[PDB]
Symmetry: D2
Amino acid sequence: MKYMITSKGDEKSDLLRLNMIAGFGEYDMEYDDVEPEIVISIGGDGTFLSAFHQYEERLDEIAFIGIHTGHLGFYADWRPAEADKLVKLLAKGEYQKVSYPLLKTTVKYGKEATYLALNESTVKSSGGPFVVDVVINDIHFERFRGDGLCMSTPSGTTAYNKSLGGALMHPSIEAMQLTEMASINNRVYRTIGSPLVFPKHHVVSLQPVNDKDFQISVDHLSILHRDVQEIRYEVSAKKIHFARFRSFPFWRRVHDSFIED
Amino acid sequence: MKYMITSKGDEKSDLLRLNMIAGFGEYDMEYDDVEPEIVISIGGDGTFLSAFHQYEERLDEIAFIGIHTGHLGFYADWRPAEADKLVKLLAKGEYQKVSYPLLKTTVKYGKEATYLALNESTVKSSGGPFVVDVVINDIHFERFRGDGLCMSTPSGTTAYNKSLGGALMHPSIEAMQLTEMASINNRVYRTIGSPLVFPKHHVVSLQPVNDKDFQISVDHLSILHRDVQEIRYEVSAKKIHFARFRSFPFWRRVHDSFIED
Amino acid sequence: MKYMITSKGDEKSDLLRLNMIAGFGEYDMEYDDVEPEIVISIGGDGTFLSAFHQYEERLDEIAFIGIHTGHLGFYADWRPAEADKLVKLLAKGEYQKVSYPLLKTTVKYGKEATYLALNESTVKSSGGPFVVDVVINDIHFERFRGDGLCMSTPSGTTAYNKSLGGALMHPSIEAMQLTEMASINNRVYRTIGSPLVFPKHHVVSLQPVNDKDFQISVDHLSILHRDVQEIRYEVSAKKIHFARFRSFPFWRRVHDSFIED
Amino acid sequence: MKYMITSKGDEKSDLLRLNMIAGFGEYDMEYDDVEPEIVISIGGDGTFLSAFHQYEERLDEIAFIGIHTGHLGFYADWRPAEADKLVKLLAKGEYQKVSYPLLKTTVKYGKEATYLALNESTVKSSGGPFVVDVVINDIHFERFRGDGLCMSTPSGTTAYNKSLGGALMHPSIEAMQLTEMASINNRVYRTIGSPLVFPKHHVVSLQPVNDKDFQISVDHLSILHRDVQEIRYEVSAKKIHFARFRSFPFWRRVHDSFIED
Ligand SMILES: C#Cc1nc2c(N)ncnc2n1CC
Ligand SMILES: C#Cc1nc2c(N)ncnc2n1CC
Ligand SMILES: C#Cc1nc2c(N)ncnc2n1CC
Ligand SMILES: C#Cc1nc2c(N)ncnc2n1CC
């Protein structure tokens, strides 16, 4: 089909990209970075995240694949030595596809901006104290005071979510997970503390109490938003599709990354 | 229909039970604690757990309801003043039912014992050091050294799971959560640390490394098992059914219990 | 003696300041905000922190006292109704003084800036990834990757240190405590995780690995420092002196603030 | 002087013991396991703990030394290849000694038992729910509900204390640290959560609320105590003395054990 390859930019990943293109030249494949059906990422998980966001409006027409030239990644989970075998099997096609859930972030102002996250979306203040009211399906759940909040996808749970104490969720679970950053808890101010895992169709709404300016991240992207009335989280209707060419279980990927490999 | 009522035993809960029975006597209801279709628990969540385990072989033919005479419970979530209104609506029937997932524990010896948990199942040693190999879907994930492990249901996540750092999961998610108790982590011994959330059909197997005697809890029940070859966790095929007579969202129940009420 | 009074600025604290000044006018007291020997703070702990930093070059010649017009503070630990009794006992003098340790932060460039902290000093990146090498008494201890680090005084342990998982230390202990913010731990990157408590004369040095720009906070003050070669932490030789006019134990102050009052 | 050597019992440690004894036979040394002045432990930290407790009534007349035949220990911190050099320098004497603080546990009944701990002392229930009132210097601080409590020495902070979230304290600090095991925190029951670090002369008292039977551990020893009225913790007046024959900083020992070696 049509395909394209993004590279981290170092000479290891560029030279690997050129060899795969040359290998693809021996099959019924067309290089097209406008409307590809296969997107190959060569580098690390950061390279994969840029590839995902480069094409986030054609997600249902694309199967992603990642090659790690550095350490093993959770998205770039195939080694460079497998590139030739990867070229042949992608060209023959007829592979199976797997889908991971995504997170939808809505930012409203007094003007509504929506973002798609593969890992997580975080909210911090623009300098002063961070205070928001946390609303779950229209019921006021808590007044959070602290550094910030993080809403993670299942496959994002091994990233910033993990460093904040969140649970690791198998990506077949259509859910999102909210974790706290350095919350203040005393006799006056009370947060839940524990991570919270929300199913599909649950809406988590953040509403300002005083300051209306927040630094909002979506994966790598981080923008200062001004005059926001609401931050809105829910599991996206859209999913990311991975080209699957062998068995590499998520829990094995967790073992290889954090226990030993 | 047929119904029965269990009481914590104090005079507040016994006298409330007698008044509901007398109130039920004005309707087409039959008291039967052998084959009831409605099980009413009056006391706390512990009273509810005993009622659940008393009838865990007729789970698909029973709708449970709980009344808290002490503080608000996550299962006994209706107040005693609502008993009269509860009697009338149960008698008329035509209520909606909600279902929560359950945890299945299998203990094998050298002789296989299965248990159903509404909250969680924990494993500790019988005295000496607790060491098990943790196997996820037949792949060896980690060698756990510490005090013990805890596998929780979604509705159990607000109980022992919460005290161990686990996430709170909405009970509509068919999953189970594994949390660590005081794990040893150094250069030699490595555990994942983070809680792990497993979907249906994932099997988590604990296998002894040296000692074969473990103290295993299932909700309130705690038995010392000897000569065990494997402890096996998975989401049960069976579910507990609750009689639903108004809207009391899980996240509101979490708010009322941990934030303020 | 000479004395001065700072107020949070609201009319509750200003009117309380004027009444204490008028009450002081009936004794051998002189209002002097240039070289006072008694510094009275009326407001909250933030008002007290500004008073401490306003006079941090005359620390050995000043006894501080704090009045909380809002909720109970750890430094402003006397209620407004005690102001009249406070005026009379300060004027008579002959009170006992208590001393708390302080934290010394040294920032070197390629140009060396020293700061005194009553609560804590934190280090974060100026945007990108935060990576520093952590050196303890000239031995390289770890390479920290994460959001940032926090070094707390004993009396600061109930503030940001507590929200990060740090221990609460009784202020009679001459020490400082280092806590991590959202550290990354996998097979490649390893931090200690646990808070670290250092005695006097131990020097904790942070050294950049790549980026040389850091956002450094000292209590409330937060400055972006550029071209820094080293951040240096140690227990200060200087201490803050409190005028003590009755028994209010630190652990009781902890109980009143976090358990119930 | 007089000396003795304890061995873990495996043939590696026994054969090393015999060679050191033979090496000691070439100097003015006497083997005496009744009144030694040097106690050599060959094995692991567990072997060292037994040696410490074997002679805990002659602590001020003994300098301890530990040899690790397995992995590096925090007390057995010298390798077997250094045994010959260790023999020669102990025989010549004139070494420097270092001292670590110890923890004193007092158990009173309705009959008072005192124990000395090098690592920590823990308290759990004998089966049912664990509830104690926590009293600090005669002020009631909290009502703890959970699995148990752990009071650690400074050098014990790298052991069970670390697994419970406690801070690592440099052993030159005369203090003790209290950490919680799986505490219950909701609207009704409140604990401090954070570890607590207490200086010398602070007394931490545990008092039963209902059940009077507790499983109390002191390092390796674990005894079920019945009819206890109070558990009493404070920094001991006694200290353990180590023979110091080169520089091996505590923080380097922490680095080698948890970061990499
Ligand atoms: C970029 C990126 C990224 N995504 C991750 C993930 N989903 N799990 C673990 N590590 C991850 N990284 C690297 C920091
Ligand atoms: C028995 C019981 C019980 N079940 C609970 C639950 N699911 N969530 C929160 N608290 C709970 N309890 C009381 C200790
Ligand atoms: C400003 C300030 C301040 N200092 C504190 C402290 N030492 N302990 C607890 N809370 C504290 N605050 C309020 C956020
Ligand atoms: C026995 C023993 C022992 N004491 C220790 C200590 N003080 N720090 C770290 N590990 C330790 N161990 C081994 C479990």
